[PDB]
């Protein structure tokens, strides 16, 4: 059949002007979107973006590409796209996206005798996802992919989620060590710029952050460094150097925790839920030092009192820290 | 995630035709491909990394894939030279996978990477084991040098936290604990307990000096034996 088909294709593309959309002067082109998510590869709090990989399929109808004779849907080489009209769909909020190239440009064209075109792309985008790190690392974020046409207004192009709620697939395939996808949402809107009104589709994820990493790397070091500070209460007041070692080292290892923990984030000007926890932990260790400094100030003047300060501290400090934890954790879970 | 075909000096691709009509189309490609990793038994782990090969547009109605030469279709696994891993076996698979747009051919190449532990003993296990041994030296020092024995206590506890943090920093931000993370956690117990031991000794050191000295004399033998037997159970469990 091979010669018959080359002609039917050649006639399709004889006189075909890629500069003109379907129904050029006429009604807008309904373009159907269909996404199959492969993976989210990365989520950066520092750059407030995430990197996404998807199969991006588009269906539209170009009457210029109808064929009656042939009894099947025609899958042609990807290179035909260069000599077809395709919709000018881009991602409004992307920082850098690219279309995979190996071994051939990862794009599909399937024609139907209808004239309906199926235009698939494999794309990885890194898109902006502004983050509210106020309840970090007990937070969740809403990352989106805004899909729009660059040049063609609502007078020329329409977008719709092909299959409605069921237009997007693959959210289950997302495997992030640090997050988990609680839900996703599809939206359809018209947005208005100076140059006119454009169609948009908005894909959204909600990422709930897993805290496992942060207990290991922050909460335990903080909680243990607070417990360490309060051991000095069980050492005789008279080893002044020993108990300054406990004081000074715990205070410095607290500042270093607060700084190193701040270094994995963007330079936001607010305090995170972790930053409070660490700040409070700093209070408990700095207090533990000042406590001893006071004990040492009475330790010959009024030795009875100094030893009572310790005996009180040995019980007040852990109880306050214990009850603080129960309030903090309840508040932020 | 990102692949490319080498370009120098010409696009690294071959076409050889046969009078048959058979075409031979060679490419030299470097891919970086996703390999989800189960780091639970890290660094005493192994991983299964794959290369899933499929056609983008053409269904099973238009294209079929097959491993040319069956078992012997893939070569060069012997040439792989990784400092950190070793390839214990590889596997070829042939499948048909079904999407919404239809059924496509796939071939799946798989490796099993067994991780060599040499790097991790040097950079972690030894620092941890030595830092635990260091903590237990304080048991052999006169209890009455309170500052001396707090130096042993505090420094060993801090050098333990910094090991557990720095060891966590070379990994992804996974929410589970690795086999190394347990080892380090247990090592932290042995050093924090060594401190609390002394703190207790110091609490009796005038009240009941006989008792305080017995705590040390017990600790001097209990602590190393427990750490020694812990190692023998941990290493047996993870080898």
């Amino acid at each position: 059949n091979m010669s018959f088909v080359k002609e039917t294709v050649d006639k399709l593309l004889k006189g075909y002007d890629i500069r003109l959309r379907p129904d050029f002067g006429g009604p807008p082109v309904c373009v159907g979107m269909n996404i199959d998510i492969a993976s989210i590869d990365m989520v950066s709090e520092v750059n407030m973006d995430y990197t996404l990989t998807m199969y991006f399929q588009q269906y539209w109808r170009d009457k210029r590409l109808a064929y009656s004779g042939i009894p099947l849907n025609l899958t042609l080489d990807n290179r035909v796209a260069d000599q077809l009209w395709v919709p000018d769909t881009y991602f409004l909020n992307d920082k850098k996206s690219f279309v995979h190239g190996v071994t051939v440009k990862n794009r599909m064209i399937r024609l139907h005798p209808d004239g309906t075109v199926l235009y698939g792309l494999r794309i990885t985008t890194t898109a902006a996802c502004m983050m509210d790190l106020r309840r970090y690392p007990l937070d969740e974020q809403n990352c989106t992919l805004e899909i729009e046409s660059y040049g063609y207004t609502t007078d020329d192009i329409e977008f719709y989620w092909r299959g409605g709620d069921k237009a997007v697939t693959g959210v289950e395939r997302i495997e992030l060590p640090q997050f988990s996808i609680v839900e996703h949402r599809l939206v359809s809107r018209n947005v208005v710029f100076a140059t006119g009104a454009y169609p948009r589709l908005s894909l959204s994820f909600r990422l709930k952050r897993n805290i496992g990493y942060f207990v290991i790397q922050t909460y335990l070091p903080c909680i243990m460094t607070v417990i360490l500070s309060q051991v000095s209460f069980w050492l005789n007041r008279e080893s002044v150097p020993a108990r300054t070692v406990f004081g000074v080292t715990t205070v410095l290892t607290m500042t270093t925790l607060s700084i190193s923990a701040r270094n994995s984030l963007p330079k936001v000007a607010y305090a995170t839920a972790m930053d409070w926890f660490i700040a409070v932990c700093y209070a408990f260790v700095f207090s533990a030092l000042i406590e001893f400094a006071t004990v040492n100030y009475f330790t010959k003047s009024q030795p009875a009192r100094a030893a009572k300060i310790d005996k009180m501290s040995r019980i007040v400090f852990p109880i306050l820290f214990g009850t603080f934890n129960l309030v903090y954790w309840a508040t932020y879970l | 995630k990102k692949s490319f075909v080498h370009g120098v000096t010409v696009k690294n691709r071959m076409i050889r035709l046969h009078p048959d009509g058979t075409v031979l189309y060679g490419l030299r490609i470097t891919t970086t491909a996703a390999c989800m990793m189960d780091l639970r038994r890290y660094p005493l782990d192994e991983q299964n990394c794959t290369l899933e090969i499929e056609s983008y547009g053409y269904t099973t109605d238009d294209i079929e894939f097959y491993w040319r030469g069956g078992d012997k279709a893939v070569t060069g696994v012997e040439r792989i030279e990784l400092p950190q891993f070793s390839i214990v076996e590889h596997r070829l698979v042939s499948r048909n996978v079904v999407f919404a747009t239809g059924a496509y051919p796939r071939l799946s190449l798989s490796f099993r990477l067994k991780r060599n532990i040499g790097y991790f003993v040097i950079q972690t296990y030894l620092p941890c084991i030595m830092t635990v041994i260091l903590s237990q030296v304080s048991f052999w020092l006169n209890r009455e040098s309170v500052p001396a024995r707090t130096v042993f206590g505090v420094t060993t506890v801090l050098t333990m936290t910094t090991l557990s943090i720095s060891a966590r920093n070379s990994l992804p931000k996974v929410a589970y604990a690795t086999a190394m993370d347990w080892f380090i956690a247990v090592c932290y117990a042995f050093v924090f307990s060594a401190l609390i031991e002394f703190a207790t000794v110091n609490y009796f050191t005038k009240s009941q000096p006989a008792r305080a000295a017995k705590i040390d004399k017990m600790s001097r033998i209990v602590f190393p034996i427990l750490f020694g037997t812990f190692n023998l159970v941990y290493w047996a469990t993870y080898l």
Partner: nanobody
Framework: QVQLQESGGGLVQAGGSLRLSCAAS????????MGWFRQAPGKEREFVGA????????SYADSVKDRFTISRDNAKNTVYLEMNNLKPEDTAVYYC??????????????????WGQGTQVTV
């Protein structure tokens, strides 16, 4: 390899509830997604729903939507299927399946590598 076994299937009266379990053993990491299928006596094997490795994301058939819920507990290597407000149309042998990481679409059973010999539910 992976081995799946179900339980919890039995006789239930209409509008009733029932909880099916699927306990897994072996290389569960290589097969992260779990799926539920049901096979009526005459009809073909139907997709019920499925759940992700993280357990966060799920997906259900329309017929079963809003009346069933699938949950995961990786602690016990088990996925659960709670079926509430049961109808006689739900009567079937309910199967538990595990899918490979890159095995294509959820709905199609071809793609699942490992199954468990199902448990009967009658309504």
């Amino acid at each position: 390899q992976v081995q799946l076994q179900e339980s919890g299937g039995g006789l239930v009266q209409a509008g009733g509830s029932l909880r099916l379990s699927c306990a897994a053993s072996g290389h569960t990491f290589n097969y992260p997604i779990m799926g539920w299928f049901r096979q009526a006596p005459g009809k073909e094997r139907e997709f019920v729903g499925a759940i992700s490795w993280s357990g966060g994301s799920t997906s259900y058939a329309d017929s079963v939507k809003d009346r069933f819920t699938i949950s995961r507990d990786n602690a016990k290597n088990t996925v659960y299927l709670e079926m509430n407000n049961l109808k006689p149309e739900d009567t079937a042998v309910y199967y538990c399946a595990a899918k490979g990481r890159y095995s294509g679409g959820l709905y199609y059973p071809t793609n699942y590598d490992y199954w468990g010999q199902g448990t009967q539910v009658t309504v």
